[PDB]
Write an enzyme that holds these catalytic residues in place. Structure first.
Site, PDB file in Angstrom:
ATOM      1  N   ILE A   1       0.813  -1.216   0.000  1.00 47.63           N
ATOM      2  CA  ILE A   1       0.000   0.000   0.000  1.00 47.63           C
ATOM      3  C   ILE A   1       0.857   1.282   0.000  1.00 47.63           C
ATOM      4  CG2 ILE A   1      -1.908  -1.225   1.125  1.00 47.63           C
ATOM      5  CD1 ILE A   1      -1.196   0.458   3.670  1.00 47.63           C
ATOM      6  N   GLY A   2       2.166   1.118  -0.182  1.00 45.52           N
ATOM      7  CA  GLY A   2       3.117   2.234  -0.198  1.00 45.52           C
ATOM      8  C   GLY A   2       4.530   1.739  -0.489  1.00 45.52           C
ATOM      9  N   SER A   3       5.288   2.528  -1.259  1.00 44.06           N
ATOM     10  CA  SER A   3       6.633   2.140  -1.720  1.00 44.06           C
ATOM     11  C   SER A   3       7.522   3.358  -1.977  1.00 44.06           C
ATOM     12  CB  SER A   3       6.541   1.285  -2.992  1.00 44.06           C
ATOM     13  OG  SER A   3       7.706   0.495  -3.179  1.00 44.06           O
TER      14      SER A   3
ATOM     15  N   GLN B   1       5.735   6.936   1.488  1.00 47.98           N
ATOM     16  CA  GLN B   1       6.440   6.917   2.777  1.00 47.98           C
ATOM     17  C   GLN B   1       7.167   5.591   3.039  1.00 47.98           C
ATOM     18  OE1 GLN B   1       4.844   6.040   7.017  1.00 47.98           O
ATOM     19  NE2 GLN B   1       4.558   8.272   6.819  1.00 47.98           N
ATOM     20  N   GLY B   2       8.045   5.201   2.116  1.00 52.52           N
ATOM     21  CA  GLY B   2       8.823   3.967   2.264  1.00 52.52           C
ATOM     22  C   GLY B   2       8.010   2.738   1.909  1.00 52.52           C
TER      23      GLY B   2
ATOM     24  N   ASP C   1       6.039  19.661   8.251  1.00 46.85           N
ATOM     25  CA  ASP C   1       6.013  18.906   7.009  1.00 46.85           C
ATOM     26  C   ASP C   1       4.705  18.157   6.761  1.00 46.85           C
ATOM     27  OD1 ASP C   1       7.344  18.335   4.588  1.00 46.85           O
ATOM     28  OD2 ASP C   1       7.889  16.337   5.311  1.00 46.85           O
TER      29      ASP C   1
HETATM   30  O1  LIG Z   1      -4.630   3.730   6.115  1.00 48.22           O
HETATM   31  C1  LIG Z   1      -3.457   3.797   5.806  1.00 48.22           C
HETATM   32  C2  LIG Z   1      -2.319   3.556   6.710  1.00 48.22           C
HETATM   33  N1  LIG Z   1      -2.442   3.239   7.967  1.00 48.22           N
HETATM   34  O2  LIG Z   1      -1.295   3.030   8.753  1.00 48.22           O
HETATM   35  C3  LIG Z   1      -1.107   3.773   5.867  1.00 48.22           C
HETATM   36  C4  LIG Z   1       0.270   3.718   6.101  1.00 48.22           C
HETATM   37  C5  LIG Z   1       1.157   3.982   5.063  1.00 48.22           C
HETATM   38  F1  LIG Z   1       2.481   3.932   5.290  1.00 48.22           F
HETATM   39  C6  LIG Z   1       0.697   4.310   3.792  1.00 48.22           C
HETATM   40  C7  LIG Z   1      -0.666   4.373   3.560  1.00 48.22           C
HETATM   41  C8  LIG Z   1      -1.573   4.106   4.590  1.00 48.22           C
HETATM   42  N2  LIG Z   1      -2.965   4.106   4.604  1.00 48.22           N
HETATM   43  C9  LIG Z   1      -3.808   4.428   3.458  1.00 48.22           C
HETATM   44  C10 LIG Z   1      -4.243   3.171   2.757  1.00 48.22           C
HETATM   45  C11 LIG Z   1      -4.923   2.163   3.435  1.00 48.22           C
HETATM   46  C12 LIG Z   1      -5.323   1.023   2.756  1.00 48.22           C
HETATM   47  F2  LIG Z   1      -5.991   0.049   3.413  1.00 48.22           F
HETATM   48  C13 LIG Z   1      -5.041   0.879   1.406  1.00 48.22           C
HETATM   49  C14 LIG Z   1      -4.363   1.880   0.735  1.00 48.22           C
HETATM   50  C15 LIG Z   1      -3.961   3.030   1.404  1.00 48.22           C
HETATM   51  O3  LIG Z   1      -3.284   4.018   0.752  1.00 48.22           O
HETATM   52  C16 LIG Z   1      -2.624   3.661  -0.468  1.00 48.22           C
HETATM   53  O4  LIG Z   1      -3.591   2.971  -1.268  1.00 48.22           O
HETATM   54  C17 LIG Z   1      -4.053   1.723  -0.726  1.00 48.22           C
END
Ligand SMILES: O=C1/C(=N/O)c2cc(F)ccc2N1Cc1cc(F)cc2c1OCOC2
EC number: 2.7.11.24
Length: 345
Positions: free
Chosen positions: A25-27, A28-29, A142
């Site tokens: 769901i992220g790649s 904030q790292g 930030d």
């Molecule tokens: O809720 C968070 C989260 N929580 O720690 C969280 C933590 C992260 F480091 C990055 C995103 C987070 N997101 C957004 C997020 C949640 C999902 F279930 C699915 C996706 C989400 O965002 C990207 O797209 C798919």
């Protein structure tokens, strides 16, 4: 063995066996969503690869570990678990942070039009999270939409604790939400974060980044273009070399707030909606202020008519965290042990 290894794109995640069905769901790292079999809920898992590799990665990782631990506010992301698969300091490489999960980034919410109740509630919670931070002495500097996550029921949490610096990254650091006092390096107080909230809110309405641009030069041009050249009062507070540059830029009168944010961008079909539109624009005009001496405070903005309907003394005035030498410079090896020590606890 307590751990298993699974390929998630070009990263191997080696995590405890409780965590399953990992999805990037992220790649904030590098971040995965996962199901946690022990707590019977979904979690976010962030892989910190070699966080001690440089001072910038090491400060942020250490600050993220310490503060996420001793901060307990509903509008700041909670840490559930911290682990390393490596068994000794010599072997030590990766840290995995286990956080609670929500549904989306603020980036995805910006792409949709929101009613005033939801828009104002999100803004209220951002203000709550920030205020709690300020009372611990944490000024963020930030806030950006990618650091802010939301749930279907409109609940909001902040992911990081902001700025504490060269790096060899392929990625670029976003500048679009940083305050005039940061861009021009002139010192700052609490209301430095109010600027950032004004940028987000204005992006929520316009559905476009207010002040994009490749560099701090391009970025400043965009600010003054829309808001106008700031006062002599502001000018006199600038270091003569910065002051020389700012005063010798092309001048703009700037735009009024009705012009910058027309009614077509706000829901305004009904009378309740028309009144909220004007309240939302008033508050924008008080957050998007270049001179921080004239920009609204966090407390003033919580008392604003657009916001104050949600006001809760339990959410707004929650006991400040206790919290320690956090201007730290260390070598790689020293950072490695401070982080391991913290992870092992
Ligand atoms: O809720 C968070 C989260 N929580 O720690 C969280 C933590 C992260 F480091 C990055 C995103 C987070 N997101 C957004 C997020 C949640 C999902 F279930 C699915 C996706 C989400 O965002 C990207 O797209 C798919």
């Amino acid at each position: 063995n307590q751990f298993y290894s699974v390929e998630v794109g070009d990263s191997t995640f080696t995590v405890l066996k409780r965590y399953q069905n990992l999805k990037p769901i992220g790649s904030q790292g590098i971040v995965c969503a996962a199901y946690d079999a022990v707590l019977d809920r979904n979690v976010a898992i962030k892989k910190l690869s070699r966080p001690f590799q440089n001072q910038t990665h090491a400060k942020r990782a250490y600050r993220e570990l310490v503060l996420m631990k001793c901060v307990n506010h509903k509008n700041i992301i909670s840490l559930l678990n911290v682990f390393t698969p490596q068994k000794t300091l010599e072997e030590f490489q990766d840290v995995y942070l286990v956080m609670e999960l929500m549904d989306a980034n603020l980036c995805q919410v910006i792409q949709m039009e929101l009613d005033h109740e939801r828009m104002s509630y999100l803004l209220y919670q951002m203000l709550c999270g920030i205020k709690h931070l300020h009372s611990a002495g944490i000024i963020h500097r930030d806030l950006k939409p990618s650091n802010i996550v939301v749930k279907s029921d409109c609940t909001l949490k902040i992911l990081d604790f902001g700025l504490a610096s060269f790096m060899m990254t392929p990625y670029v650091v976003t500048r679009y939400y940083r305050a005039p006092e940061v861009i021009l390096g002139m010192g700052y107080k609490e209301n430095v974060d109010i600027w950032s909230v004004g940028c987000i809110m204005g992006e929520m309405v316009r559905h476009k980044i207010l002040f994009p641009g490749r560099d701090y030069i391009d970025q400043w041009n965009k600010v003054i273009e829309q808001l106008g050249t700031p006062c002599p009062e502001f000018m006199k507070k600038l270091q003569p070399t910065v002051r020389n540059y700012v005063e010798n830029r092309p001048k703009y009168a700037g735009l009024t707030f009705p012009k910058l944010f027309p009614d077509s961008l706000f829901p305004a079909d009904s009378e309740h909606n028309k009144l909220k539109a004007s309240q939302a624009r008033d508050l924008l005009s008080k957050m998007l202020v270049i001179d921080p001496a004239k920009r609204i405070s966090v407390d003033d903005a919580l008392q604003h008519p657009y916001i104050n309907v949600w006001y809760d003394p339990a959410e707004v005035e929650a006991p400040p965290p206790q919290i320690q030498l956090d201007e730290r410079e260390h070598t790689i090896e020293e950072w490695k042990e401070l982080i391991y020590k913290e992870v092992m606890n």
